[PDB]
């Protein structure tokens, strides 16, 4: 629930950084801010990798979900940590941005939905078992 709002917040931020508006495609504030900031740091320290993140996926509305699912399953196959979670959001951001660049606007809301569902079913259990998001804020804020 607030997981959905987390996802929309980060994606808005990343979209806004490239001149796009979320609106065109559709405490807890300490968690958002920290995530925004971690994602920025991620994208900065690995700017090269990130300049061409999703190019080689050849995203289409038909293949989108399967590309997304394959990447996220591999990313977490052998475990979760906070940095991998950050990679996850940053990945989602790159994916949205590319969609719009490529004029596949429809994908943005879907991607948001996929991340929200993945977060709820696959990550939140680890998150609770590991302190909740308030821990994230402590370590990465």
């Amino acid at each position: 629930q607030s997981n959905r709002e987390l996802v929309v917040d980060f994606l808005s931020y990343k979209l806004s950084q490239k001149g796009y508006s979320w609106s065109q495609f559709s405490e807890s504030e300490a968690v958002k801010q920290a995530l925004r900031e971690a994602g920025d740091e991620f994208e900065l320290r690995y700017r090269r990798a990130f300049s061409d993140l999703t190019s080689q996926l050849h995203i289409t509305p038909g293949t989108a979900y399967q590309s997304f699912e394959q990447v996220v399953n591999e990313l977490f196959r052998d475990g979760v940590n906070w940095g991998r979670i950050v990679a996850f959001f940053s990945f989602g951001g790159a994916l949205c941005v590319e969609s719009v660049d490529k004029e596949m606007q429809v994908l943005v809301s879907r991607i948001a939905a996929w991340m929200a569902t993945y977060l709820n079913d696959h990550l939140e259990p680890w998150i609770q078992e590991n302190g909740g998001w308030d821990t994230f804020v402590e370590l990465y804020g």
Binding site: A38, E41, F42, R45, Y46, A49, L53, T54, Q56, L57, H58, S67, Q70, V71, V72, N73, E74, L75, N81, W82, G83, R84, I85, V86, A87, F88, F91, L139, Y140
Partner: peptide, 26 residues
Amino acid sequence: ASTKKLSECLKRIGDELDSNMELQRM
């Protein structure tokens, strides 16, 4: 196969970022 390389990359980067934030925590 291009999805493997990406997530391998994603995994490598995130694990490193996470490493650093652990060194800081000490």
